[PDB]
Amino acid sequence: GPEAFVVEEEGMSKVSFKITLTSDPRLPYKVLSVPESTPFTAVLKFAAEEFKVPAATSAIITNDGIGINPAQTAGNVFLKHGSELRIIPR
């Protein structure tokens, strides 16, 4: 019967973030894409590499300026915060 048809999961396999270095008034950005299951620590590592800044002294925050727990997936960050993120010194 109809109870036997279930939407078990839904998502998007490729997650894209537009990460802006907002301390620089030219607002340099990178659009980075990663698998949905990518640990967010690896997104910070990728972004720091592309911006040529040390991952250890950098952080990624939401467009609204709030911190993100790194121990979650890229897909979950996108679900909560959308695509626009900022890279800042920590």
Numbering used by the authors: -10 to 79
The paper states:
Ubiquitin-fold modifier 1 (UFM1) is a UBL covalently conjugated with intracellular proteins through ufmylation, a reaction analogous to ubiquitylation. Here we identify a UFM1 substrate, NADH-cytochrome b5 reductase 3 (CYB5R3), that localizes on the ER membrane. Ufmylation of CYB5R3 depends on the E3 components UFL1 and UFBP1 on the ER, and converts CYB5R3 into its inactive form. Ufmylated CYB5R3 is recognized by UFBP1 through the UFM1-interacting motif, which plays an important role in the further uyfmylation of CYB5R3.
To determine which region of UFBP1 is required for the interaction with UFM1, we prepared a deletion series of UFBP1 (M1–M5) and performed a pull-down assay. This revealed that UFBP1 M4, which covers amino acids 116–214 and is conserved across species, is essential and sufficient for the interaction between UFBP1 and UFM1. Analysis of the secondary structure of UFBP1 M4 revealed that the region comprises a coiled-coil motif, a β-strand, and an α-helix, and the β-strand contains FVVEE; overall this structure resembles the UFM1-interacting motifs (UFIMs) of UBA5 and STK38. We crystallized UFM1 in a complex with the UFIM of UFBP1 (aa 194–202) by fusing the UFIM at the N-terminus of UFM1, and determined the crystal structure at a resolution of 1.6 Å. In the crystal, UFBP1 UFIM bound to an adjacent UFM1 in a head-to-tail manner; a single UFM1–UFBP1 UFIM complex is shown in Fig. 4e, left. UFBP1 UFIM has an extended β-conformation and forms an intermolecular, anti-parallel β-sheet with the β2 of UFM1, which is similar to the way that UBA5 UFIM interacts with UFM129 (right). Further, three hydrophobic residues of UBA5 UFIM, namely Trp341, Ile343, and Leu345, engage in hydrophobic interactions with UFM1. Phe196 and Val198 of UFBP1 UFIM are positioned equivalently to Ile343 and Leu345 of UBA5, respectively, and demonstrate hydrophobic interactions with UFM1, whereas no residue corresponds to UBA5 Trp341. In addition to hydrophobic interactions, UFBP1 Glu199 forms hydrogen bonds with the side chains of Lys3 and Ser22, which likely play an auxiliary role in increasing binding affinity. An in vitro pull-down assay showed that a UFBP1 mutant with point mutations at Phe196 and Val198 (UFBP1F196A V198A) hardly bound to either free UFM1 or ufmylated CYB5R3.
